[PDB]
A paper describes a structure:
HCF1 is initially expressed as an approximately 210 kDa protein that is activated by limited proteolysis (protease maturation) within the proteolytic processing domain (PPD), consisting of multiple 20-residue repeats. A depletion of OGT leads to an accumulation of full-length HCF1 protein and the PPD is proteolytically cleaved by OGT via an unusual glycosylated glutamate intermediate. In the OGT:HCF1PRO structure, the peptide substrate spans the whole length of the TPR domain. The peptide interacts with the TPRs through some of its side chains, but intriguingly five regularly spaced asparagine side chains in OGT form hydrogen bonds with the HCF1PRO peptide backbone in a sequence-independent manner. We noted the fortuitous proximity of the HCF1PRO C-terminus to the OGT N-terminus (CαHCF1–1340-CαOGT313 approx. 12 Å), and wondered whether this would enable the direct tethering of substrates to OGT via a fusion linker to allow us to explore OGT-glycosylation substrate complexes. We first demonstrated that this fusion approach recapitulates the published HCF1PRO peptide binding mode and then used that to reveal how the C-terminus of the OGT glycosylation substrate TAB1 is recognized by the enzyme. Remarkably, this is also similar to the proteolytic cleavage site of a HCF1PRO repeat, with the major difference being a glutamate at the acceptor position. PCR primers (6H_HCF1_GGG_hOGT_fwd GTATTCATGCATCATCACCACCATCACccgccctgcgagacccacg, 6H_HCF1_GGG_hOGT_rev CAGGTTGTTCAGGGAATCAGCATGGGTaccgccaccggtggcggtggtggcggtg; 6H_TAB1_GGG_hOGT_fwd GTATTCATGCATCATCACCACCATCACGTGCCATACTCCAGCGCCCAG and 6H_TAB1_GGG_hOGT_rev CAGGTTGTTCAGGGAATCAGCATGGGTaccgccaccAAGGGAGAGGGTCACGCTGGTC) were then designed to introduce a TAB1 or HCF1 peptide followed by a GGG linker in place of the PreScission Protease site and the first two residues of the hOGT, changing the boundaries to 315–1031. Crystals grew in 2–3 days in 3.5 M sodium formate, 0.1 M Tris pH 8.5 for TAB1-OGT fusion and 1.3 M ammonium tartrate dibasic, 0.1 M Tris pH 8.5 for HCF1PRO:OGT. Crystals belong to space groups P6122 (TAB1:OGT) and P6222 (HCF1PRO:OGT) and have one molecule per asymmetric unit.
Residue numbers in the entry: 297 to 714, 719 to 744, 763 to 1029
Write the structure that this text describes.
């Protein structure tokens, strides 16, 4: 689940009418462009007092009311505009944008297609329709509609920028360098003319925008929330100045749209219950309804308090609830992601408000005080990228729930088909008892099942695509068929009950060569990165690159570019996206993971390391380009971090060419995923608590936020 693509409202210039009403409407349009929203509203309402049946003024007013979050009142005016003027295409397109924001995709499509039916040359409606295709996952149709819009209106920043991100999703790098310069130039122009930047904050990390531009895009996006809360005219809240009402406990509120089957929960679902109740009182504020999964069950049971704000959709009232609960530190787990209701933070119901874990960037906004990070991810020298003060965790700010979700991957055994650690692999909770039932098993620690009757039967189950067999009373599962056996084991909601078998043959990977993997969404790849990967493959004779169809339509673009850099097609192998458990388990088949420098694996980096797979990374400047080095520093593998592209290629080549070195580094990862802090949620929670108390003490003594960066 991605964010919703932004749309373009069309301001209608009034002509041919009474001078007074036309002038009021047109000047109102200008005041709206300048960010004088209230004054715009006053002017459209004067225009309507002068000429009650003024279709343009109804539609333009509705467009500013939509900006203010007054969606139902906006719809009322759009409909009045269309009643007065049934072929008013601007009003249908604008109404479309309002319906989209209300999550009525069908209504939005009905409005945009009506607009286009009225006026086929209406660029903005084509662009808005494009945004629906983009959000549906129909990239080729989104690209087509954005191209139509740009053909009709060649200077069209929202269309251009949303097109660029469509192209990024499918690794279309046609005219890439010129495209990157153009995005920078658009953003420069919009920041100068004080118009909302067409690059979304979350996407800004992918383009060679300056840090100040990235921060400024973030800020301007935060400012949208201000326009929505300003109409509530709510006074500042009075905050606790001590812990007396909470009996000496710090009240921490975790606000997320992701308490359910979402990557954020896959990272931090154990944290609420690990909080120490003698000093901390945990409130979890869900922005989404209960999705039925055990992720939601666990957080509901373990948190001291759970509060469903999806049932309190008015932001003023939701913020009042947070304030009534007495929260000292309110934690924004969303940032600029779908489901966020950053208006809640803009209302400042708590005295300390911190960004944490869910969003890999700055809010840019005055209403957030701190970003929870660490010295590797966010060295003080690069503080300019963030509006918040830095608040350092002692190792990495990243965490994962892999030890609780995937304990079956803490140990493995192999079958010696013919000794490799990653060709044919077994994992399971009863694996030890299964192996004790085979009298001929030998220990390397990694148990090895020799080629014997039992091993042949296992390999036969895999070769034939059978679901499972029973040997010696133990169920032995095909790793491709987990969802047919237990759907909750496949999603990570429960620990699998069978012994699962995972093989290179299941994914068409070679038995006698090095497998380099990357399991991120393809948008994280750029031309430099694929050239680096080709250089590595070229230096490691029969090695392959294992990527995902994420999405499948990017595959022929990656293959063509790879061919142009001298790789044959057979050197890159694509697999489908898998269920969570399979995705983590099958990383055990790779030799090495090659991290994406543009935007690293985050969740995906923790996934690969839980399998014992060394990851090679090159940290950049942005928070999103530095997370994997931070994970690796915490893990205790500094030799896997490159300072430049030559070193990343050399590290990866050496891992694929010196097999003793490979085994040594693999063994470090395998061991340190348990012995290091990286996956230790109890330790993590204890250090987060100390950080929270540093925040609180500083506030309680009467200070504004400061960087909390002391080694
Ligand atoms: O084959 C796959 C590949 C990925 N994932 C999961 O898909 C999500 C990818 O989210 P995102 O692209 O946000 O990951 P990040 O950017 O954090 O690495 C993560 O939860 C992965 O564990 C999956 O379940 N199956």
């Amino acid at each position: 689940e991605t964010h919703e693509t932004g749309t373009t409202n069309t301001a209608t210039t009034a002509t041919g009418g009474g001078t007074h009403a036309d002038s009021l409407n047109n000047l109102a349009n200008i005041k709206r462009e300048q960010g004088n929203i209230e004054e715009a509203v006053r002017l459209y309402r004067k225009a309507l007092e002068v000429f009650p049946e003024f279709a343009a003024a109804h539609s333009n007013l509705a467009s500013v009311l939509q900006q203010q979050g007054k969606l139902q009142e906006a719809l009322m005016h759009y409909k009045e505009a269309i009643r007065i003027s049934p072929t008013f295409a601007d009003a249908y397109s604008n109404m479309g944008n309002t319906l989209k924001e209300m999550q009525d995709v069908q209504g939005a499509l009905q409005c945009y297609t009506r607009a286009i039916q009225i006026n086929p040359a209406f660029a903005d409606a084509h662009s808005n329709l494009a945004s629906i295709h983009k959000d549906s996952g129909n990239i080729p149709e989104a690209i087509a509609s954005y191209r139509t819009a740009l053909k009709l209106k060649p200077d069209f920043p929202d269309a251009y920028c949303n097109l660029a991100h469509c192209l990024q999703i499918v690794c279309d790098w046609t005219d890439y360098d010129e495209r990157m310069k153009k995005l920078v130039s658009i953003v420069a122009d919009q920041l100068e003319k004080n118009r909302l930047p067409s690059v979304h904050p979350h996407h800004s990390m992918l383009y060679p925008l300056s840090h100040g531009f990235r921060k400024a895009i973030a800020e301007r996006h935060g400012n949208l929330c201000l326009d929505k809360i300003n109409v509530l005219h709510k006074p500042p809240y009075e905050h606790p100045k001590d812990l007396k009402l909470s009996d000496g406990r710090l009240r921490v509120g975790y606000v997320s749209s992701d308490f359910g089957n979402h990557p954020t929960s896959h990272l931090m679902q154990s944290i609420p219950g690990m909080h120490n109740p003698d000093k901390f009182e945990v409130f979890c504020y869900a922005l989404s309804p209960d999705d039925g999964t055990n992720f939601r069950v666990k957080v509901m049971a373990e948190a001291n308090h759970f509060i469903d704000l999806s049932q309190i959709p008015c932001n003023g009232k939701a913020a009042d609830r947070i304030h009534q609960d007495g929260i000292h530190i309110l934690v924004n787990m969303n940032g600029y992601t779908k489901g966020a209701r950053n208006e809640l933070f803009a209302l400042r119901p708590a005295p300390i408000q911190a960004m944490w874990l869910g969003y890999p960037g700055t809010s840019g906004a005055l209403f957030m005080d701190y970003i929870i990070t660490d010295q590797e991810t966010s060295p003080a020298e690069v503080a300019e990228q963030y509006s918040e003060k830095l608040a350092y965790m002692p190792h990495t700010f990243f965490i994962g729930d892999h030890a609780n979700m995937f304990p079956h991957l803490k140990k493995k055994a192999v079958i010696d088909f013919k000794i490799y650690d990653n060709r044919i692999v077994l994992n399971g909770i009863d694996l030890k008892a299964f192996l004790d039932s085979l009298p001929d098993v030998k220990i390397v620690n990694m148990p090895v099942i020799p080629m014997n009757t039992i091993a042949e039967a296992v390999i036969e189950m895999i070769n034939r695509g059978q679901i499972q067999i029973t040997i010696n009373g133990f169920s032995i599962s095909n790793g491709l068929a987990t969802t047919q056996i237990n759907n909750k084991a496949a999603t990570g909601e429960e620990v699998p009950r069978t012994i699962i078998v995972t093989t290179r043959s299941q994914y068409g990977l070679p038995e006698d060569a090095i497998v380099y993997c990357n399991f991120n969404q393809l948008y994280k790849i750029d031309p430099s990165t694929l050239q680096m990967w080709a250089n590595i493959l070229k230096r490691v004779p029969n090695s392959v690159l294992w990527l995902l169809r994420f999405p499948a339509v990017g595959e022929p673009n990656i293959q063509q570019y790879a061919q142009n850099m001298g790789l044959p097609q057979n050197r890159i192998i694509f697999s489908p996206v898998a269920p969570k458990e399979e995705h983590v388990r099958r990383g055990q088949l790779a030799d090495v993971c090659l991290d994406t420098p543009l935007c690293n694996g985050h969740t995906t980096g923790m996934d690969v390391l839980w399998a014992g797979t060394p990851m090679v990374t090159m940290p950049g400047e942005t928070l999103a380009s530095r997370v994997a080095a931070s994970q690796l520093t915490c893990l205790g593998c500094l030799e896997l971090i490159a300072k430049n592209r030559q070193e990343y290629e050399d590290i990866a080549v050496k891992l694929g060419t010196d097999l003793e070195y490979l085994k040594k580094v693999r063994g470090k990862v395998w061991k340190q995923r348990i012995s290091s802090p990286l996956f230790n949620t109890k330790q993590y929670t204890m250090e987060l608590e100390r950080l929270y108390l540093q925040m609180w003490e500083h506030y309680a003594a009467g200070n504004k936020p400061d960087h909390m960066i002391k080694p």
